[PDB]
Structure 1
Amino acid sequence: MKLKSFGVFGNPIKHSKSPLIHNACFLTFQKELRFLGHYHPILLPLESHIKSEFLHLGLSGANVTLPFKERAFQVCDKIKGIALECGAVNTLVLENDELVGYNTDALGFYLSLKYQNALILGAGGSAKALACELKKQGLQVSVLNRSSRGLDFFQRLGCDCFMEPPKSAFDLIINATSELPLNKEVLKGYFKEGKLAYDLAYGFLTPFLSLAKELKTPFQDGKDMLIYQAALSFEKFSASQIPYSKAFEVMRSVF
């Protein structure tokens, strides 16, 4: 049989655990796949073009992380699935010689979650998918950032958008930014009244999460969402031949 290349585009990329869990699946499922799969971390220059590099490297599939998720959306020949509402793409597959973009953050996030409203900190690709998913569940959603970038997107979703921290209670406080992401005391009142502090970062313990832990607020890091979204991308990487639940169990064991 034959060799197929995959990877994860990101800057930075050193700390990504996608190659670990995807390589495990490519090894485990190789007879069903009927190819030899290998998944690399690919550090992309900021100035670079996701589509051109995908093609030049001859990949069959890829994941996309910070800060490239919205750009991935703009440069795909074709967008399918919930990605169409996400304004962001974290999953790339070569299909009929066309670069096709999907989003597995949205469902991956939903699966990671064991809530009436939410506050999202951040405005990038991850924040965009989570707001889409959470509006889709009938939650009230507020988005807080320093500038007004992404206004249009979140406002058309029907999110409440803010640059000053709203004086309100939220069940979910979500750190989807790229130091603390807010004034310590502001973050403290959010936690005091919040039900879950949720941070998309994984593999290390962020200031945001230390502070919640410190204040006895229930907290969750990005590990579960990482594995679900990876599992889901894998399903797309297999031509839909290995279901995400199978991928998911292998990916959980290795981690």
Structure 2
Amino acid sequence: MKLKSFGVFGNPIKHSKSPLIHNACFLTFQKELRFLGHYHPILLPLESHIKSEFLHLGLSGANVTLPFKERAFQVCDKIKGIALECGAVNTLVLENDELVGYNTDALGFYLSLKYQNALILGAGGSAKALACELKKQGLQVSVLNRSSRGLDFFQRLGCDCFMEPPKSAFDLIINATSASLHNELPLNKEVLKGYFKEGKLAYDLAYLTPFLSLAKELKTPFQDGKDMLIYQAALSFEKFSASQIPYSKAFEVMRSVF
């Protein structure tokens, strides 16, 4: 076969299930694609440059995870699709010798949902894409962080932005911080209890975190990041396939292997 290389840039990255599910698709769809893709995790030093590394490795495409999604948006040659409004890129493809950035987190999150308003905790690339998608669907969106980081982005979307937890009921409480990665809660336990009591769904992007365990304890409906991982990956695979394998087909393979 002709070979094409792919990977996922993150720091940390060893916990990522992206290689498992992407390689399963590359194997399954090799006849249709007429190439064999192979996908590897790439622990990127914080000081490195996504574009330079993508070119250096000779990748045909890649995903980008924490803490690099906003940087990836900055260093792409071209941004396409909903990524234009996300200020973050999680999917890279070499198209006509240009590094092109997409964002599949926004739609992957949407598709993962079985709500009138939402509280998003966090200010990184995942939070930005989720806020963009939820504002687009007509929910009221509040965002809660510890500093004024990312504030301009969310305010331009029309989000209500907070550093002190708002005394308001939210249908969706979404943990898009890095707290779960580190085995800690993203907020004071009693504050979260307040939200969970009045919430319809506690959603954590990690794929049992302290956030989800607390929701469980309180009998609040909860959802981890598994379905989102599969949909965003499937949507990325569509892009890696030059839009020849539809995300629905990739989803099936990925969900089963995961």
TM bin (shorter chain): over 0.9
SS in 2 for 1:70: helix
1-structure distance, mates of 2:168, 2:107: 27
Report how far residue 19 of structure 1 moved: 0.3
1-structure distance, mates of 2:46, 2:195: 34
1-structure distance, mates of 2:188, 2:253: 40
SS in 2 for 1:111: helix
**Equivalent residue number for residue 182 of structure 1:** 187
Report how far residue 184 of structure 1 moved: 0.5
SS in 2 for 1:198: strand
2-structure distance, mates of 1:78, 1:191: 40
**Equivalent residue number for residue 32 of structure 1:** 32
2-structure distance, mates of 1:80, 1:14: 28
Instruction: Give unpaired runs (5+ residues) of structure 1.
Output: none
Deviations 1:2-43 (A, max 9, x none): 111001000000110000000000000001000111000000
Report how far residue 70 of structure 1 moved: 0.3
2-structure distance, mates of 1:207, 1:254: 26
- Identity percentage of aligned residues: 100
**Equivalent residue number for residue 180 of structure 2:** none
Report how far residue 117 of structure 1 moved: 0.4
Correspondences of 1:152-231 after superposition (within 5 Å): 152-177=152-177, 179-202=184-207, 205-231=208-234
SS in 1 for 2:243: coil
Instruction: Give unpaired runs (5+ residues) of structure 2.
Output: 178-182
RMSD value over aligned CA atoms?
A: 0.7
Deviations 1:100-145 (A, max 9, x none): 0000000000000000100000000000000000000100000000
2-structure distance, mates of 1:4, 1:143: 39
TM norm structure 1: 0.98
Report how far residue 159 of structure 1 moved: 0.2
Correspondences of 1:1-255 after superposition (within 5 Å): 1-177=1-177, 179-202=184-207, 205-255=208-258
SS in 1 for 2:213: helix
SS in 2 for 1:47: coil
SS in 1 for 2:58: coil
SS in 2 for 1:107: helix
Deviations 1:183-228 (A, max 9, x none): 11000010000000000000xx110000000100000000000000
2-structure distance, mates of 1:170, 1:3: 48
Report how far residue 54 of structure 1 moved: 0.3
**How many correspondences in the alignment?**
253
Deviations 1:19-74 (A, max 9, x none): 00000000000010001110000000011100000000000000000000000000
Report how far residue 179 of structure 1 moved: 1.2
Kindly report structure 1 stretches of 4+ aligned residues shifted beyond 2 Å. none
2-structure distance, mates of 1:116, 1:241: 35
1-structure distance, mates of 2:128, 2:253: 28
